[PDB]
Amino acid sequence: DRTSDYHKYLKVKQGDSDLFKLTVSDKRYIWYNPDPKERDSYECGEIVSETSDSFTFKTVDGQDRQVKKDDANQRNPIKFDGVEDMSELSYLNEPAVFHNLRVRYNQDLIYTYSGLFLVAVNPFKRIPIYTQEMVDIFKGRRRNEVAPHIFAISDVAYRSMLDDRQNQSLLITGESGAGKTENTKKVIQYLASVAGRNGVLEQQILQANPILEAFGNAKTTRNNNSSRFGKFIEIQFNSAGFISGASIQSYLLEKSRVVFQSETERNYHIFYQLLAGATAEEKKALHLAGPESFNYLNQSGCVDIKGVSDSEEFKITRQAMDIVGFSQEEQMSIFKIIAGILHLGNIKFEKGAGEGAVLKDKTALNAASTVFGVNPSVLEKALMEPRILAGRDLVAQHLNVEKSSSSRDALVKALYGRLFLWLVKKINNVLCQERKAYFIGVLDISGFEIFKVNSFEQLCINYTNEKLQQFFNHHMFKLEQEEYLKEKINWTFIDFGLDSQATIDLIDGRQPPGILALLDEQSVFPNATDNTLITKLHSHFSKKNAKYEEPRFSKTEFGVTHYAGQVMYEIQDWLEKNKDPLQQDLELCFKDSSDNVVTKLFNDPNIASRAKKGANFITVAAQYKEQLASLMATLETTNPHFVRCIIPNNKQLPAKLEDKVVLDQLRCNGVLEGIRITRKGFPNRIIYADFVKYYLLAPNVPRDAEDSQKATDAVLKHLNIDPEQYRFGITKIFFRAGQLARIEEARE
């Protein structure tokens, strides 16, 4: 009851007895805008009088305003305040849907169903609703039996996997720093505990994220634990139904945050966990120092995160590596690479004689060579005098300072990119015990974000977030109504106005050439510069596509109108970034290294060998588009389950819910639209034959029910369920929102 730990934090407090006096009021209020210049700051006014098609209400100041019934945003009766499934609301609109979230969010209730998907508002405070007792409660309990919780929808997916024998997937969407990553960990926590043993394999799967989070997450201005990479986690399942293995796919590692970090941002956690928290023997063994003494860590102006102990986190990272099985040496080799990368950044090239770079001080070069186990003179020549094939001859390129310091970074980014690729490979090798029968995918991705300087990585992220949103639209709006008409159910199509396939096409469109398609052309073009690229973009579709803007104010930028707003991307040096060039003498300098890992990085074809596209190597953009599209096809194979995560504010503060911010997310996520289709449509659908699965209250249910149509109708007829509430079609019976929930509860 109310004393339960679950009533305290998961269900709405029972209201005052004086509140009852108001909850029964016959009054009718309405949300309005005291300032029409701000269409997201509403206030509650009381409808005083109504004409045939108008309302008159008294503002909070007392002034009488007047509005048409068509444009009016009526307030639901306060009996709905706190309701769990928002499709049960009568007056359904942006103001009301947002108020129900203030109510719940103010009671530390962050989860709220709305239709078949789930909403999750980031609390930014540790809410004790993920303990073991919780997981035990939702084990078996139906979605309708329990309150909104990530465990609930994770169980619905699990039960839908067994009942229907179909693969599932939990698709979690949201803005940057909205709770995507945290909810995934909880989803993994639930599934593992529910379909585990009585375990090792289950313990191992849990310990994967701490590893990846150490090398994969970092501090952005939007989020102090930001996934700079995207991951799709399949939970393989046995024929019986228990977990048999797992597999992790990784995408878009922001591998240049290594060599550079924006002001107030931070490099990947793994580097700071080492310096602060490394053994005194490793410290001098790897020639380590303080964060402020390394050129790749002292530039951001920030080496410390609020309420985070890198020394303690360093413990956790290597605790997890032991559990999955990284050798005592394999771990030391990793730290060996990290130190080596830190030293590389401290190499200070200088114009010795003018013709090219000259490296006077070699203390940093050798400290990096010592760890990597490479001949420091081979590395020095491969960084500054690499060799190339001029025709068929062999020529050494006496690179200058700016061109030598870049090849340095090209190496650094290559190492870590491959290092990261190796970690996941070492993890999948121990988790892919077998190609299993069923599988549940979990999609944690780097989230839509807008920084002061937007670059290629941001485009590919937002392109992903955009592609993901349209997927939400296709299965909630387009495919849902096609099922109705596919069953001849007398449905009139509804255009909810949510479609971003235009912005997608602009980016990845092949014919006509999309943005990425031109970059590929310009990239291979030898004389292609940034001048030629940006001009080849404006001239192409400046005034030919409404999702594109050539700014009057910058010759190096272009705007794209995403589903979450317009992002002005900076084009500087995208050509090299899409080529991802790594000078070849560098690749040899390390292919002959004296370290196991470093050797496996540049000699294992799966990690070093970049695919080839006929004449030229495959580009980044071309590669990722193939990676993403491959993932999207895999998703279409499974029944999805959406979790729309929402960030309450842009300051990472708890109990500070900003109206303007939240509505922009709801407004563009289709949350409001997403309920209408659930409310005005028929969410639940089941084959007519599969419904008999026989309640011994005037029973006339033959298992082998010839003419299933009449067989099920008789049950519904006796059940005395409103026939309007359940229109049925050719092959399956369709139920309106919750109509089936009240039907299946009879058995229980």
Ligand X SMILES: Cc1ccc2[nH]c3c(O)cc(Br)c(Br)c3c2c1
Give me the residues that bind Mg ion (CB under 5 A), please: 180-181, 227
Strands 64-68 and 54-58: antiparallel
Among 104, 186, 255, 318, binds ligand X (CB under 6 A): 255
User: If binding is defined by CB under 6 A, does position 520 make contact with ligand X?
Assistant: no
Binding region for ligand X (CB under 6 A) out of 16-24, 98-106, 138-146, 454-462:
454-462
290 labelled binding-site residue: no
* Helix (H), strand (E) at residue 705: none
In the complex, least distance from residue 411 CB atom to ligand X, rounded to whole angstroms: 14
Whether 226 is catalytic: yes
Whether 181 is catalytic: yes
Question: How far is it, in rounded angstroms, from Cα 578 to Cα 572?
Answer: 12
In the complex, least distance from residue 580 CB atom to ligand X, rounded to whole angstroms: 6
177 labelled binding-site residue: yes
Among 94, 182, 310, 457, binds ligand X (CB under 6 A): 457
User: If binding is defined by CB under 6 A, does position 620 make contact with ligand X?
Assistant: yes
Selection from Mg ion, ligand X, none that 227 binds (CB < 5 to 8 A by kind) is Mg ion
Among 180, 467, 577, 736, binds ligand X (CB under 6 A): 577
Cβ atoms of residues 469 and 590 within 8 Å: no
Residue with tokens 């009766």: 77
Residue 690, Cα to own-chain centre: how many angstroms?
36
R_g of the chain, CA atoms, integer Å: 29
Name the catalytic one among 115, 356, 417, 447: 447
Q: Which phi and psi angles does 77 have, rounded to 5°?
A: -55, 140
In the complex, least distance from residue 455 CB atom to ligand X, rounded to whole angstroms: 3
179 labelled binding-site residue: yes
277 labelled binding-site residue: no
Selection from Mg ion, ligand X, none that 457 binds (CB < 5 to 8 A by kind) is ligand X
Binding mask 478-507 for ligand X (x = CB under 6 A): ------------------------------
Nearer to Mg ion by Cβ, of 217 and 712: the residue is 217
Q: Which phi and psi angles does 337 have, rounded to 5°?
A: -70, -40
Length of the chain: 748
Whether 223 is catalytic: yes
Whether 114 is catalytic: no
Q: Give the residue nearest to ligand X (CB).
A: 456
Furthest-apart CA pair in the chain: how many Å?
Answer: 100
Residues 6+ apart with CB under 8 A from 21: none
Binding region for ligand X (CB under 6 A) out of 234-242, 248-256, 708-716, 723-731:
248-256
175 labelled binding-site residue: yes
List the one residue out of 53, 55, 79 whose CA is nearest residue 66.
55
Cβ atoms of residues 32 and 46 within 8 Å: no
Q: Which phi and psi angles does 225 have, rounded to 5°?
A: -125, 85
Cβ atoms of residues 449 and 461 within 8 Å: yes
User: If binding is defined by CB under 6 A, does position 443 make contact with ligand X?
Assistant: no
Nearer to ligand X by Cβ, of 85 and 254: the residue is 254
Among 99, 104, 257, 318, binds ligand X (CB under 6 A): 257
Name the catalytic one among 100, 224, 226, 346: 226
Nearer to Mg ion by Cβ, of 645 and 672: the residue is 645
First to last CA, the chain: 20
In the complex, least distance from residue 254 CB atom to ligand X, rounded to whole angstroms: 4
Residue 63, Cα to own-chain centre: how many angstroms?
46
Q: For residues 339-398, which are near ligand X according to CB under 6 A?
A: none
Question: How far is it, in rounded angstroms, from Cα 269 to Cα 258?
Answer: 10
Residues 6+ apart with CB under 8 A from 145: none
CA dihedral 515, 565, 631, 610 (to 10 degrees): 40
User: If binding is defined by CB under 6 A, does position 253 make contact with ligand X?
Assistant: yes
Selection from Mg ion, ligand X, none that 181 binds (CB < 5 to 8 A by kind) is Mg ion
Contacting residues toward ligand X, per CB under 6 A: 253-257, 455-457, 577, 620
Which residues does the annotation mark as catalytic? 176-177, 181, 223, 226-227, 447, 449
